[PDB]
């Protein structure tokens, strides 16, 4: 119901995701995308959409 | 300056893209 709360909700949505994105980037890259969505815990389309935006 | 100004295309105006709105509901 609050626009300011939802505006910061996506700020933490990208903040907590970035903390999870830094988990897969710390080891060596060139891995399978299907295993990336299992580590983060979201759908394959959701991970590819938000990661490409950054 | 090559394949740009006067040659143009003579497509991509109306009838081509107007059909694309119907394709979204056909899937």
């Amino acid at each position: 119901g609050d626009e300011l709360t939802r505006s910061h909700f996506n700020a933490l949505y990208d903040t907590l995701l970035e903390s999870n994105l830094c988990k897969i980037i710390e080891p060596f890259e060139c891995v399978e995308i299907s295993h990336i969505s299992k580590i983060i815990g979201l759908d394959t389309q959701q991970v590819e959409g938000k990661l490409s935006q950054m | 300056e090559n394949w740009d100004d006067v040659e143009v295309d003579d497509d991509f105006t109306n009838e081509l893209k107007a059909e694309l709105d119907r394709y979204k509901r056909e899937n």
Binding site: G49 | W3, V8, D9, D11, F12, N14, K17
Partner: protein
Amino acid sequence: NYEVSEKAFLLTQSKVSIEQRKEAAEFVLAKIKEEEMAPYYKYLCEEYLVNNGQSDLEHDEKSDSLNEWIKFDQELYNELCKKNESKIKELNEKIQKLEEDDEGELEQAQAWINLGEYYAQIGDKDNAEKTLGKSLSKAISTGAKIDVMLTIARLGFFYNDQLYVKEKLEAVNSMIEKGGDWERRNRYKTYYGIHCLAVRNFKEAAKLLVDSLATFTSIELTSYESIATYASVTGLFTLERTDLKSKVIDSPELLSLISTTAALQSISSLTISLYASDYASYFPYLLETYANVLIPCKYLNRHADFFVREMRRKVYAQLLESYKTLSLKSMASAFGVSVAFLDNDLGKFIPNKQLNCVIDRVNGIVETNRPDNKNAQYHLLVKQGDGLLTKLQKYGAAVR
């Protein structure tokens, strides 16, 4: 006088509804009684043809139109002589008495300047500059300098002249350079980018439009929503995605232009879809931007197809930078396009050397081409050798 040229511009090309020309005809019929539009009123049928251009009762007698209010009558013929006698002949004898009695100097210069505005009401560009020519020698401060530019600025919007206008504005600024406020400076800047839209200078038109403020309103020369459209829409085609984030989508001004006037739907629907990386609904936003914004505006009809096609080239370019490859079912299907239409879009983009990518058929994999270690030391560096080789020996081979 731009309010007449802006509305009557719909009389040229309307592919949607005739009522757009009928609603705009009310402004032409209302303003023609207060001020004579005769030079532009006759210029309607003498500009574009085979739409409304075949209807005239004076020069060539024929009727083809979707609007019947562009034809001459006995009322405009009588009012043509009445405006010439009342607004000119009556006020010309009063100024003539001031020249014979020798009263003041600058006051007599302002008399020809004030009278020169009546020549724009009756639509005489020849005597308008003649009255300002006598007051040009007596002009000192910016009071009489800008008023001369006002008539020259009317030549561009009212008479549709992109040549003799911008040449005179550069001469006035070189004479007395002050600038006053931002609105006096935008007249030397914002209008300069408007004339560049005709010759298609790409970024050279939008250089001074982005830095221009959204509070600029010249009334007769230009309106509030007119500059709001030319500044916001043109800045989207020019500035790349790096500048779209800190300027277009986030602005203290531009965000107030589309919020007040909802007929834009450009800096919002287009930029959010590019920021959210959703191209499924990004395509139909171009139709509402092309048909309801680009077409009805005057100076936005010069490019026509050069608008959307440049965005159709840059919409996939952003997706190519975020992935080393691409799928066919996610592009030629999920985006709303087809296989044959997508191949025609990207078919002419690659050979023009604007971007580079790889397309496949059996696998249907769209691969992104990257410069890797090439960058500017591969081509531009080799091209720089011959680029400075010809210009260096051009003046050296002729000796003296």
